[PDB]
Structure 1
Amino acid sequence: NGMIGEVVYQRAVMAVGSLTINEERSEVVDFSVPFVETGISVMVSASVWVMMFVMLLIVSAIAVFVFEYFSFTIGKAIWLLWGLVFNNSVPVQNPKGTTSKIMVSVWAFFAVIFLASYTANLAAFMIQEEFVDQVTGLSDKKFQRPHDYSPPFRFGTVPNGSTERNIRNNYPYMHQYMTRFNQRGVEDALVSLKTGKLDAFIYDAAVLNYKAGRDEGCKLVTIGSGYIFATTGYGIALQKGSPWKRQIDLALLQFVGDGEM
């Protein structure tokens, strides 16, 4: 039925409109070569402190040598080794040591440049914008059973579509899952995803990219680029024995190879 029977019973000539291509459609007609990569998809919503700690014992032995030079700065020396990293300025001890007031002019500058490098680290983390994905694709463990995970989720496809036949050739049990997960309208499923009446949805990826580029807020985010998916194309169906096919294919190869596409 549909656009297929108009070509099979030859009331029409060719299907210039967009059409998914599978095996049994190619059994009855002869498709042209495709021009656009349109797959399917699912729409969803250590040693830094160590090198300081090694030299901390060396500076503590230097403070012991200050005590040997010329009277209780042991744990206060640990406070000083903290303050030469952090500069908290707690009133405890006035340093009377000749040597002990010399290396502080290096260690406090090291603390200043370490604080500047930590601000640089936080600015570089501000540059980094993260994006995580719960589902990777068709090889998800969520696709085993929604009762296996704690939320029983829901996802369907277009009714009476070729994606239904593709999944029935992929997984007949997934057809039984989608049998309670059917829907009618594409924008109705969009509203169900926005309001929360639907969890996931399987559809052709390029139309979802066209809708996501005009999405109000970019809340619904696709997953990947068709890596664990069908990743098919869109050609033009013609009747078997039509002489126009070679010329139309040369026109396609001209229309792609010029940047006008």
Structure 2
Amino acid sequence: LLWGLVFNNSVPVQNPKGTTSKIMVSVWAFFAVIFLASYTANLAAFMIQEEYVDQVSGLSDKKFQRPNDFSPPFRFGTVPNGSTERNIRNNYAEMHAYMGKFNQRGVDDALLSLKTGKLDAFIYDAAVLNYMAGRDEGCKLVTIGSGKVFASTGYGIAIQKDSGWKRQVDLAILQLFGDGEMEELEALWLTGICHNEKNEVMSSQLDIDNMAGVFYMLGAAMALSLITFICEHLFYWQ
């Protein structure tokens, strides 16, 4: 009676005919309301402030190591002839060999292919991609994690060997760092629009993937009930 009453009068029962039983069940039912209700919001509050996690850890993960052993593998490629592939062709020779199956061209075509589901991952220079996020209509593209980099390099100014202009320009650029106007330049060119703290959008329709836990609990309950049945019967006929 009480174990069912704790949860929305769900079970029809027969009520004891006493008085102190009456007062006890009343106070338990009160304990009841709060407990259930409190659980309901807290759950609502928890699901309000979720945190989205991308379906990859990094370039070093096995998900990019043995594509053949999974669901239909990630279709990912890079624009050729750049410095990116030379890094790839020196540490992941087998992965580079698998790369050539798609062999994208340019940048905009790759972006469009990603938007249409033909591609599902991309490797290229860090600076260009970070800028490309804030220009697209809407915000359906984001880098992995917090924009982390895996090979810390930088751009520069390439000049012919053995000239004093090397010393001159190298000392001069630090002057530009000194006055902080490059902050103004960044605020004018490379700043972005959206991606304010990754507020996430919405869960929807709660497909089968999540309720697997409660369904497994149901199946386990059925199994243990059958075991208790067989145990009781075998012990009983003895």
TM-score, normalised on structure 1? 0.60
Q: Which residue of 2 aligns with 1:151?
A: 72
Q: CA contact under 8 A between 1:137 and 1:227: conserved in structure 2? A: no
1:183 is aligned, of 78, 94, 104, to: 104
Using the alignment, how far apart are the partners of 1:207 and 1:224 within structure 2?
Answer: 17
Q: How does 1:69-84 map to 2 (within 5 A)?
A: 79-83=1-5
1:127 equivalent to 2:48? Answer yes
Question: One-letter code of the match for 1:157?
Answer: T
Q: Deviations 1:141-187 (Å, cap 9, x if unpaired)? A: 12223212231332222221111222223323333222333121201
Using the alignment, how far apart are the partners of 1:102 and 1:125 within structure 2?
Answer: 35
Q: CA contact under 8 A between 1:154 and 1:200: conserved in structure 2? A: yes
Using the alignment, how far apart are the partners of 1:138 and 1:130 within structure 2?
Answer: 22
1:166 equivalent to 2:87? Answer yes
Using the alignment, how far apart are the partners of 2:68 and 2:8 within structure 1?
Answer: 55
Aligned residues: 181
Q: Which residue of 2 aligns with 1:247?
A: 172
Q: CA contact under 8 A between 2:67 and 2:73: conserved in structure 1? A: yes
Q: CA contact under 8 A between 1:142 and 1:148: conserved in structure 2? A: no
* Higher Rg of the two aligned structures: 1
Q: CA RMSD in A?
A: 2.6
1:204 equivalent to 2:129? Answer no
Using the alignment, how far apart are the partners of 2:141 and 2:152 within structure 1?
Answer: 21
Identity of matched residues, %: 80
Question: One-letter code of the match for 1:199?
Answer: D
- The 1:164–1:92 alpha-carbon spacing in structure 2 relative to 1, beyond 3 Å, is closer
- The 1:182–1:122 alpha-carbon spacing in structure 2 relative to 1, beyond 3 Å, is same
Cα offset, 1:232, TM superposition: 3.0
SS of corresponding position for 1:221? strand
Larger RCO (CA within 8 A; separation ≥ 6): 1
Q: CA contact under 8 A between 1:154 and 1:199: conserved in structure 2? A: yes
Cα offset, 1:103, TM superposition: 2.0
Q: How does 1:1-261 map to 2 (within 5 A)?
A: 79-83=1-5, 85-88=6-9, 92-227=13-148, 229-240=150-161, 241-242=164-165, 243-255=168-180, 260=184, 261=186
Cα offset, 1:205, TM superposition: 2.9
Q: CA contact under 8 A between 2:79 and 2:107: conserved in structure 1? A: yes
Q: Deviations 1:65-123 (Å, cap 9, x if unpaired)? A: xxxxxxxxxxxxxx13421x124166543442121112233211111111221122222
Segment drifting more, 121-130 vs 181-190? 121-130
SS of corresponding position for 2:124? strand
Using the alignment, how far apart are the partners of 1:169 and 1:207 within structure 2?
Answer: 23
Q: CA contact under 8 A between 1:159 and 1:184: conserved in structure 2? A: yes
Q: Deviations 1:25-75 (Å, cap 9, x if unpaired)? A: xxxxxxxxxxxxxxxxxxxxxxxxxxxxxxxxxxxxxxxxxxxxxxxxxxx
Using the alignment, how far apart are the partners of 1:238 and 1:213 within structure 2?
Answer: 33
Gaps of 5+ in 2: 187-238
The answer to which structure has the higher helix fraction is: 2
Runs of 4+ off more than 6 Å: none
